């Protein structure tokens, strides 16, 4: 199963949660709650509503740089099984969750 990123609301939506809209040209949108659903349905610009996450991506309140963000990317080629590969990935994630959390703290200290 896959976590879909909400296009407008920026929420990490899950299966059985949210709504989906496709247009005839063939670009895909997944929505989290019904509020952002009617936001794109009312032609609201996501770069005009202040609570959208991608607004704060351009606003500079949220990070754009450093390799942990480059770690956040969608893979393309699958990889065969190896049990050690999961634990060396899985125990990295408690490190990944730790380093992202302390980067949140120091950057907000930098803001204020």
């Amino acid at each position: 199963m896959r976590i879909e990123n909400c296009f407008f609301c920026g929420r990490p939506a899950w299966p059985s949660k949210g709504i989906t809209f496709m247009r005839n040209d063939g670009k895909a949108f997944r929505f989290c709650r019904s509020k952002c659903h009617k936001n794109f349905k009312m032609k609201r610009n996501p770069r005009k509503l202040k609570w959208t996450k991608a607004y704060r991506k351009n606003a500079g309140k949220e990070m754009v740089v450093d390799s942990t963000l480059q770690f956040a990317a969608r893979r393309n080629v699958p990889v065969r099984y190896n049990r050690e590969l999961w634990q060396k990935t899985l125990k990295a994630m408690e490190r990944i969750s730790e380093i992202r959390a302390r980067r949140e703290r120091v950057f907000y200290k930098k803001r204020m």
């Binding site: 949210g18 709504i19 989906t20 809209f21 496709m22 005839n24």
Partner: protein, 135 residues
Amino acid sequence: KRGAPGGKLKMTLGLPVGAIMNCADNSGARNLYIIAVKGAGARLNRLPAGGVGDMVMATVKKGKPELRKKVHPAVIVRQAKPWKRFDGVFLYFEDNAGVIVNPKGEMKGSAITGPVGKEAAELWPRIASNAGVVM
């Protein structure tokens, strides 16, 4: 065998009897007029609402003069009413669209324009053949 699909459980039906939904293939039609839904139940005072991917008796009201006022079976390939897909996906199209298909499964034109519904290309195999975009 009667013109009833086998393999479609149910989605949220949103196209009832007396609905105008625009054509999708290159037969020459602009819109199709829904007049009867095949395989629907027999309930009093209930309009037979046709779901997407289901055969519907149809008539061309507006189109080219060659096939104007020609009545023939068709299947719905797109619907704009929200419906529940099997993987937890509530989803819908921009409009309500369909393609003119014979009772056996053959279709009059050559190519289907626009996207094609997931279950419509599943329960009809050669619809997926004629679909350039199906998701």
